[PDB]
Amino acid sequence: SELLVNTKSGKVMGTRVPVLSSHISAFLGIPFAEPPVGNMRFRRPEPKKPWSGVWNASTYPNNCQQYVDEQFPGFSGSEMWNPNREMSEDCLYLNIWVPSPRPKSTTVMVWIYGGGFYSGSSTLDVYNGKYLAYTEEVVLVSLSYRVGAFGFLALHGSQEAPGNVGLLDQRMALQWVHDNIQFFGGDPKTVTIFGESAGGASVGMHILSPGSRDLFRRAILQSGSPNCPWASVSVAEGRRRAVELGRNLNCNLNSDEELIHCLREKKPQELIDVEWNVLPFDSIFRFSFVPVIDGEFFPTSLESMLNSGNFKKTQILLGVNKDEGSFFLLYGAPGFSKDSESKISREDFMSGVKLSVPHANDLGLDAVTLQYTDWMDDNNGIKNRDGLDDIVGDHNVICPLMHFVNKYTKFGNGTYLYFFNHRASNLVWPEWMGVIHGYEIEFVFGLPLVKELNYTAEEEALSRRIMHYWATFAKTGNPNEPHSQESKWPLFTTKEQKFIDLNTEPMKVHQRLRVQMCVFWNQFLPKLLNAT
Amino acid sequence: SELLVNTKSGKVMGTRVPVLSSHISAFLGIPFAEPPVGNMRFRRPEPKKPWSGVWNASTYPNNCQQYVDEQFPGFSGSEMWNPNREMSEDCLYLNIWVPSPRPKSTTVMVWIYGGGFYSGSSTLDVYNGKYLAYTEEVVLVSLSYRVGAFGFLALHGSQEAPGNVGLLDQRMALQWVHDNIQFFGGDPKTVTIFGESAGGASVGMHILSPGSRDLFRRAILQSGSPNCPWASVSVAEGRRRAVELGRNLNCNLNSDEELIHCLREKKPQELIDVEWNVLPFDSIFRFSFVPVIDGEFFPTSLESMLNSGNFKKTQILLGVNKDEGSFFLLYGAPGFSKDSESKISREDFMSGVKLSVPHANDLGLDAVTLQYTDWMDDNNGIKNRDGLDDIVGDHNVICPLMHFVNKYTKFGNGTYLYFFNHRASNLVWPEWMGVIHGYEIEFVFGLPLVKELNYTAEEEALSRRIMHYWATFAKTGNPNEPHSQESKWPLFTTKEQKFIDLNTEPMKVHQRLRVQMCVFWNQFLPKLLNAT
């Protein structure tokens, strides 16, 4: 009854789950698309055909096929991001947590996982929607979408592998929420999409894309934005990477149809095993199969859409973490280690700059180096390490997001900007990595509220604060409760450019988030690279 | 007897001058060249023909023909630099201060005045040699040389106006000292040349030029070095400026001979009146007629000579002032005034940047701006003012000199580097100008020892310290007296790059003078400008 819901495509039976000292309803693994398998690999998704009988929605679904990280086998800090369910191309499912008793018509929040467009799962422990749904009385949906070549192989002009199909997977889940969430007590007119990393970029892409704009009300972007340098490629570059994927697999390259036919015969792990081989440069924070600027999902270049105001005009809430780069340096740059302070030699610093800005000419590399080197103390291994950390984070996350923030706010209806700089007391990664990419997620999803996870009481309060900001913004377009006496998170405005720190200390308002480095990344360096 | 000296060119009769509570001998206005007048304008100097009788050397000579500054008529702070004697092309004379009684064979210091190669006089009150000669028991010579077009008109290929003849004037005075100073009690094997601004560049140029190297022992450079962007031009640019000088005066431009003949028939003031018209750009800290890289006085490019060690290997002592740029901004940049704090708007800041780096493309201007702009506070008029001050001083004086210092020290026999940052208690210029270009000269020449000038006791102590460093270096190649208990001024080395502050406080040693900005000026910006 409470667990038995009739949707437009058939009946679903959820399950009653414990949350803290209470319970809520969970509907796990509801299908929203036809399985994109066989001849449907690389194709746009098709709506799930209606079923008879009762869909058993008591169990998490499979995860999409993806690279699995084996750098630190058994280490919780890396394993927590890997698929925790069987991988399958049959992976287009969504999950819903519903407060008990079922509300009449409440705010909906739809989580879009990140992972560089090459990885990610809706089913990770850290994306468990039950604490947020319970604590804030929202209906929490987590969707899924194809990643890697399966979601983003792009042979523009082919209707068999057009590109962006992972984004269309997301849109079809949004369409399903629009059509069905009312049966779960959600208001389809008050849907907030939120996501981190590639999920944050995705959220921004749905803001931009005309075919997505009417399927949600407002948006939250965490450590990602649509204009990030890793988040899209041109149709020519997508085509080059798809041809090179076939070349790595001894495919007939004479035509799109012959190439696609070859790739559809391969087993999924055969594609994944060569996925990284198509990148044009030795690099970090670059991923092979990503959204393509196609003229269809994206009518024009992202920058022109941003400049002209060709995007959904609504409220947004978004921000970044203090040390976005450390994860990527640990995994891809010389001199970094999980088990040392990772003091970086001058030689390894220069190597890291080249890996971090792979598209830069020698003059551009000199500019980055000069901008981040203290020439009174150039052999300081801590300064070299932290300088590289800032380079990676500023170039790939912080400054792209600030460009988006500044462009969006000219036309939008409300911007709230945050800077998350709390390092968790129980973090398993070493201190040099600081406030790591993605480690705000556990606070957004309320994991500090769980006694057995050993967060401090101050971190529980911060998580409660963040969840309330997020859900109140989702409900009202404003993270602040009116007539409350706590300090107010101010609108980011073009003139004053205010943001807040998110940490365990009382809220502080600042202005011009990393403005000095972002003038370098957003204006001077692009002009230098264009001119040379 | 003491005042009657027979030189190789004839007899001279000096005068006995009071100095503090004692007396010394002065030989003023001794000719060292034939008057460069008539058909000898623009020509290399010729040695002064010997004279019969006794040359009356009791009176300062004429000053060379030059632009006279009328910006602040009657204001001591600017008038103190203007000619204080009649101007004439008949101006190639030198002055000698000799301790009394005459020493047997003592250290010689030869002062070379600055003034952008367009101005300067040996007779300024601030260059009065009597305090240094008396206090430190040296023979103090001040030479003169043709400035402006008269000294540096350059039509390469012509023997009538070859260029660099002002440097040859200096050389001929050095040759005269070599041949004659023994008759005044000076040791021709222990001559130190020292100079400020264009005089400091000149000193470095004699270090470089093979024809000058054997005419002095060691060298002091104050706020000037031979590689300064204002201190030389190419043969092509020198020719262009000479032809443009003729165009401004309705001259026949068909040939060097006709152009030169036209220019030789003009009154001196006619040349001076159009001197600034030949500069290629609106600019500050740029001067029309300067040394030319000719292949003779300078066998190859200054940079190749520095790189190869093609220069005199000896000891050098050199340094800069804290606020080298303020004089040039006051006189040439919008928003600066003698009678106000000169807070600079963003608009006037950008205007000043273009005036300060006139040769830079737009990308180069952006680089300079970004490097000197605090984008958290870009409308701060004080920061904008001081940022421009730093731009002018760093680009034109400090970083060229640090490049010279580093190249020289690889081959030289001892480098001593200073940073003069004491603002005189009795300065007549406003406080925003700080420690002005040229305002260390009055300390080098011992003016604070004159009670009537109202320096503090601490400034008298600083002047005496500086005079003793300069003269002890002149005598020994080391500003420090061994066996002494004074703090020691350390050698500048390639590895440690130490320098001292010169001020009224106890000595501080620092390393890497303005290294961050000078990497920008000496490595990055030239590379940006060469790419584009």
Ligand SMILES: CCC1=C[C@@H]2Cc3c(c(N)c4ccc(Cl)cc4[n+]3C)[C@H](C1)C2
């Ligand atoms: C690569 C993109 C990516 C983004 C998200 C965040 C993320 C992921 C990881 N596997 C990580 C593995 C090690 C470390 Cl220290 C951080 C990670 N983090 C922060 C996945 C993959 C999800």
Ligand SMILES: CCC1=C[C@@H]2Cc3c(c(N)c4ccc(Cl)cc4[n+]3C)[C@H](C1)C2
């Ligand atoms: C322009 C070159 C130049 C360098 C020397 C120092 C100098 C000179 C001036 N006329 C100055 C006029 C005003 C001020 Cl505030 C400073 C000046 N200072 C510092 C002459 C001319 C000699």
Ligand SMILES: *[C@@H]1O[C@H](CO)[C@@H](O)[C@H](O)[C@H]1NC(C)=O
């Ligand atoms: C749904 O699946 C779970 C486990 O897969 C099972 O325990 C439950 O009984 C199922 N519901 C049915 C079969 O109605």
Ligand SMILES: *[C@@H]1O[C@H](CO)[C@@H](O)[C@H](O)[C@H]1NC(C)=O
């Ligand atoms: C949002 O839009 C409404 C309706 O036009 C307007 O009244 C309000 O001022 C806007 N708020 C912001 C922050 O732009």
Ligand SMILES: *[C@@H]1O[C@H](CO)[C@@H](O)[C@H](O)[C@H]1NC(C)=O
């Ligand atoms: C959390 O703390 C409890 C109680 O002190 C301890 O038993 C447990 O091992 C801790 N959990 C983790 C994951 O460290």
Ligand SMILES: *[C@@H]1O[C@H](CO)[C@@H](O)[C@H](O)[C@H]1NC(C)=O
């Ligand atoms: C030399 O000139 C000075 C200054 O005018 C004068 O006092 C002196 O009498 C002159 N000497 C002779 C011998 O004329």
Ligand SMILES: *[C@@H]1O[C@H](CO)[C@@H](O)[C@H](O)[C@H]1NC(C)=O
């Ligand atoms: C200067 O040269 C002398 C003689 O060759 C040498 O002994 C001395 O080490 C040199 N000093 C410096 C500071 O280079």
Ligand SMILES: *[C@@H]1O[C@H](CO)[C@@H](O)[C@H](O)[C@H]1NC(C)=O
């Ligand atoms: C020096 O200071 C005294 C006392 O302040 C003053 O009388 C005198 O005029 C000053 N000298 C000059 C040259 O200004």
Ligand SMILES: [Cl-]
């Ligand atoms: Cl079924």
Ligand SMILES: [Cl-]
């Ligand atoms: Cl850190």
Ligand SMILES: [Cl-]
């Ligand atoms: Cl605004």
Ligand SMILES: [Cl-]
């Ligand atoms: Cl100042």
